[PDB]
Amino acid sequence: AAQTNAPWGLARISSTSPGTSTYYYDESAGQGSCVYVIDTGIEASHPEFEGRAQMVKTYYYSSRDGNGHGTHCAGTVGSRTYGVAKKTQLFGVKVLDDNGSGQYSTIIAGMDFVASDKNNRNCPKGVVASLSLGGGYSSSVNSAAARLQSSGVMVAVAAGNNNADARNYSPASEPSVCTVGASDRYDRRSSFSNYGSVLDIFGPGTDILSTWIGGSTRSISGTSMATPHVAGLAAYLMTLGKTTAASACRYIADTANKGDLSNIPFGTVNLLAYNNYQA
């Protein structure tokens, strides 16, 4: 399948080179996989989700995404026009408030929730969790992300937007999950992206068009935008049977575009998520 005039990030993950405009992807599109978006929620009614999104848990008064961030990330995972895995199922877990903030204990609870809740869902091609969030280092947040990964969920987490070493941020610093840095459409590390030995992979993160609340769309930037590219690609590759939740991050790194990025500090991987799609 080919989506013409796609958002640059979708084009980038299906090309060995920057500057293309078509998103080439296998039509299975993540069907049969499930991605939990742990964030401000998901506006499931957005026409771009086509019925495939639902809220499953909130830690606040409403399940409504009153911010847009979680809707945007969910759209990059799996919306029709803006998504990597256009046929995946999306489950929203609202651990962040409508200002985009959330206490670590609530974020931990939401990770534990996904580890259990997945056992009640029919996700035959496997389960992914996209965590476009984080703050300062916390061993308990890291442990929660490690548990979620251990339970059988492919966990993708943002590296953080501090232009600093991700070792000081969580859950970015948890080794066992897939920590995602951000790049721009010219294949530079995004100016804000964290870096460091713990990063596993980079994804498109600067000027990412996706769904927004109110049935709208907008472009925003962050490692929060790169993370759902990788979560969606994992779902896509799991549906293709090329990898599993336990091994998807390593598979994505070993099939990434290598050395294409600039302003990567020595000791940080130079790997850009790539679907390797061949018609």
Question: Which positions make up the binding site?
Answer: 16, 175, 177, 200, 260
Other Cβ atoms less than 10 A from the Cβ of 138: the count is 18
Of residues 240-269, those binding Ca ion (CB under 5 A): 257, 260
AA identity, residue 5? N
224 is catalytic: yes
Choosing from 69, 72, 173, 221, which is the catalytic residue?
A: 69
39 is catalytic: yes
Query: Closest-CB residue for Ca ion?
Result: 260
65 is catalytic: no
- Omega cis (within 30) before 171: yes
Determine which residue in the list 1, 16, 21, 105 makes contact with Ca ion, applying CB under 5 A. 16
Which residue, 58 or 143, is less far from Ca ion as judged by CB? 143
Identify the helix (H) or strand (E) that includes residue 169.
strand 169-170
C-alpha atoms less than 13 angstroms from C-alpha of 128 in its C-beta half-sphere = 38
**Cβ proximity of 276 and 254 under 8 Å:** no
Which residue, 184 or 260, is less far from Ca ion as judged by CB? 260
Of residues 22-51, those binding Ca ion (CB under 5 A): none
Of residues 150-209, those binding Ca ion (CB under 5 A): 200
Min dist CB 132 to Ca ion, Å, is 16
**Cβ proximity of 94 and 100 under 8 Å:** no
Min dist CB 163 to Ca ion, Å, is 20
Min dist CB 200 to Ca ion, Å, is 4
Instruction: Give the contacts of 119 (CB within 8 A, at least 6 positions apart).
Output: none
Instruction: Give the contacts of 104 (CB within 8 A, at least 6 positions apart).
Output: 135, 138, 140, 141
Which residue, 40 or 224, is less far from Ca ion as judged by CB? 224
Task: Compute the 3-state secondary structure of the chain and give helix, strand, coil in percent, each to the nearest 5.
Answer: 25, 25, 50
What binding mask, one character per residue, do residues 90-109 give for Ca ion by CB under 5 A, x or -? --------------------
Choosing from 14, 33, 39, 98, which is the catalytic residue?
A: 39
Which residue, 43 or 200, is less far from Ca ion as judged by CB? 200
Choosing from 130, 151, 170, 224, which is the catalytic residue?
A: 224
Instruction: Give the contacts of 91 (CB within 8 A, at least 6 positions apart).
Output: 34, 35, 36, 37, 53, 54, 55, 56, 114, 117, 121
Which residues pair with residue 160 across a beta bridge? Answer: none
Min dist CB 24 to Ca ion, Å, is 15
Stretch that binds Ca ion, among 15-23, 29-37, 144-152, 212-220 (CB under 5 A): 15-23
Which residue, 53 or 155, is less far from Ca ion as judged by CB? 155
Instruction: Give the contacts of 192 (CB within 8 A, at least 6 positions apart).
Output: 161, 162, 163, 182, 221, 222, 223
Count of residues that bind Ca ion according to CB under 5 A: 4
Binding-site entries for Ca(2+):
16, 175, 177, 200, 260
Give phi and psi for 170, each to the nearest 5. Answer: -135, 150
Min dist CB 267 to Ca ion, Å, is 14
Active site residues: 39, 69, 224
Footprint of Ca ion (CB under 5 A): 16, 200, 257, 260
